[PDB]
Design a binder for this molecule. Structure first.
Ligand SMILES: [Cl-]
Lengths: 177, 180
């Protein structure tokens, strides 16, 4: 049947979330379409690491970047990227117990946040994280066709590591429930 | 038959080794004889983490003789011999001649400085010997993780070991006195 034209990336990841006491090994598969920049892909991956779960899956139209479904087939977590509009955010928030949004394009995001902050506050179950240009570029450097990563999370800070390098990642919390 | 009088410790351990590109889960079991200090047992556990392998087994001679842990190959030979303490020439010789690779974990500041001063030039003669030291301070902090039932996470990068459980998180820096 149908298939996506895309580049396949594999990541063996170890996550130690010391805030949550969440310890997990997973092997992730990311499909990157020519329309997706390296950064946005790595932001996806970062997103996954922050909400690491055995059940948390990527997916692709109008679906989230990733979702975690429960035993009754409903959406526990909806992960979204970019700078969505009123109708898009409403779609996610009313369809999912929790929504986590990752905003990223500095110039674009500030204008979007100035024009939306007051409207996003309307959704009781919405989290908004921002990651600035520099950090996004640094996260993106970790990109490899085959990746082996370990992520330690403590006090909101994400310590991201491979064989060669070590990076402190600090997501900014624009909104929290 | 025969059996050791000892206290049993269980450890679920997850190791994320970035130096060796190896992620591993294991259920360890340590038997601690009354003669063994808590520190020495925790040093064993740490050494297991550094050389983590599905086949790396602790062992003690019931009949002393044996290493603290060894890793046997498919032809029943010893690939890795892990030794703890401050052994003499004959003991070291026995380990290095019987094993492809020997890892010795020295500890106790006072005794070890003397030992290394009178042995540096003699260990160097064994081309398959690695000597790691852990200082008194670090050892005590590693010792603090001891519980009869343990859940441990370890990340390794640049020879540094980030060790953690549900309470605490600790950076461990073994000193390399000698490498092959
Ligand atoms: Cl692996």
């Amino acid at each position: 049947g149908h298939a996506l034209k895309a580049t396949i990336y594999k990541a063996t990841v170890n996550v130690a979330d010391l805030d949550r006491n969440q310890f997990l090994d997973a092997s992730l598969t990311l499909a990157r379409h020519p329309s997706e920049t390296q950064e946005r892909m790595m932001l996806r991956l970062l997103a996954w690491l922050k909400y690491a779960d055995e059940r948390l899956q990527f997916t692709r139209d109008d679906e989230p970047e990733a979702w975690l479904r429960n035993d009754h087939l409903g959406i526990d977590l909806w992960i979204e990227l970019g700078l969505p509009d009123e109708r898009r955010i409403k779609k996610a928030c009313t369809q999912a117990a929790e929504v986590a949004l990752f905003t990223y394009n500095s110039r674009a995001a500030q204008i979007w946040w100035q024009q939306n902050q007051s409207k996003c506050v309307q959704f009781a179950n919405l989290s908004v994280w921002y990651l600035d240009d520099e950090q996004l570029a640094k996260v993106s450097a970790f990109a490899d066709r085959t990746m082996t990563l370990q992520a330690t999370i403590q006090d909101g800070v994400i310590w991201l590591s491979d064989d060669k390098n070590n990076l402190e990642v600090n997501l900014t919390a624009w909104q929290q429930p």
